[PDB]
Amino acid sequence: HWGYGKHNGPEHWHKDFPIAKGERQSPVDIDTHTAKYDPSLKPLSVSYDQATSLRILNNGHSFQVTFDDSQDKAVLKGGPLDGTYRLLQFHFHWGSLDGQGSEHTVDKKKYAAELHLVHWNTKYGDVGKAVQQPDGLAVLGIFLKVGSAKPGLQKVVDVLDSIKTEGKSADFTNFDPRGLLPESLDYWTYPGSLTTPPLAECVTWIVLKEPISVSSEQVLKFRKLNFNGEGEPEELMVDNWRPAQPLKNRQIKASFK
Numbered sequence: 560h561w562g563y564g565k566h567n568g569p570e571h572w573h574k575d576f577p578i579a580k581g582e583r584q585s586p587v588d589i590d591t592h593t594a595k596y597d598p599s600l601k602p603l604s605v606s607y608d609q610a611t612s613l614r615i616l617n618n619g620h621s622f623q624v625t626f627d628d629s630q631d632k633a634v635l636k637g638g639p640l641d642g643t644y645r646l647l648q649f650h651f652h653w654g655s656l657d658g659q660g661s662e663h664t665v666d667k668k669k670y671a672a673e674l675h676l677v678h679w680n681t682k683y684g685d686v687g688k689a690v691q692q693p694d695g696l697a698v699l700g701i702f703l704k705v706g707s708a709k710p711g712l713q714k715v716v717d718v719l720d721s722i723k724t725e726g727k728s729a730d731f732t733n734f735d736p737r738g739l740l741p742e743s744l745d746y747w748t749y750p751g752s753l754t755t756p757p758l759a760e761c762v763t764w765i766v767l768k769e770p771i772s773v774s775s776e777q778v779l780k781f782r783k784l785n786f787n788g789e790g791e792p793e794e795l796m797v798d799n800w801r802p803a804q805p806l807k808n809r810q811i812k813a814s815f816k
């Protein structure tokens with residue numbers, strides 16, 4: 560029912576998900592001058608060495624690669640996290656044009672896309688219990704800009720033709736998530752929400768300072784995807800991003816001076 564068009568887009572979501580006007584909603588603009596360097600933060604430790612990708616799926620608002628999370632195979636720990644968070648999926652948000660597409664903004668600058676890597680707190684047992692917890696989820700957000708091609712993205716790009724419309728999935732084994740990470744792991748962090756319905760306020764956002772670059776041909780193939788399912792009017796999947804929400808009583812902390 561909810562979507563990203565004029566009639567079902569982010570400005571209507573509060574009618575079905577009243578938490579959309581809550582206190583810790585996401586995304587936000589990261590004012591880099593008002594973020595506080597916090598030395599009490601630990602380095603991010605990404606242990607994706609034994610990650611097990613399963614499928615890629617068009618869910619009708621994005622495409623999503625899923626992982627086997629029944630074991631500590633790909634985990635995130637450190638940073639502002641307490642405990643161990645298992646990788647569950649990643650997905651992308653992107654625009655119709657290269658000057659918009661990201662959900663988070665940095666000094667009001669929008670990037671061409673955003674990669675979201677979704678992890679959940681193992682102490683809660685499964686992901687459906689974690690999403691009801693104030694600290695149940697950790698999302699690692701990575702900006703994409705348009706420049707040179709990114710090799711570790713090309714395997715995703717090559718299969719997009721197989722999942723063009725909503726509900727299609729394809730096998731997607733032996734994918735390495737480390738190929739999507741920038742060279743530096745400097746980050747901002749703040750407590751937030753999911754950026755799509757149901758917009759649960761369960762996320763510790765970790766947003767990386769350094770973007771990854773992708774080529775225009777690579778992003779062009781993202782925009783060839785469809786919101787609709789097969790046998791329907793053709794709606795290209797673009798501008799699947801929520802606009803920035805007020806920070807309200809929240810401080811953004813930085814891991815880097």
Ligand SMILES: NS(=O)(=O)c1ccc(O)c(NC(=O)NCc2ccncc2)c1
Pocket residue numbers: 675676677698752753754755756757
């Ligand atoms: N962009 S995000 O903050 O990293 C993010 C991370 C994990 C998520 O699960 C979502 N949200 C969904 O996956 N919503 C599907 C759904 C829609 C309506 N009813 C039930 C389920 C957003």
Ligand SMILES: [Zn+2]
Pocket residue numbers: 650651652675754
């Ligand atoms: Zn997302």
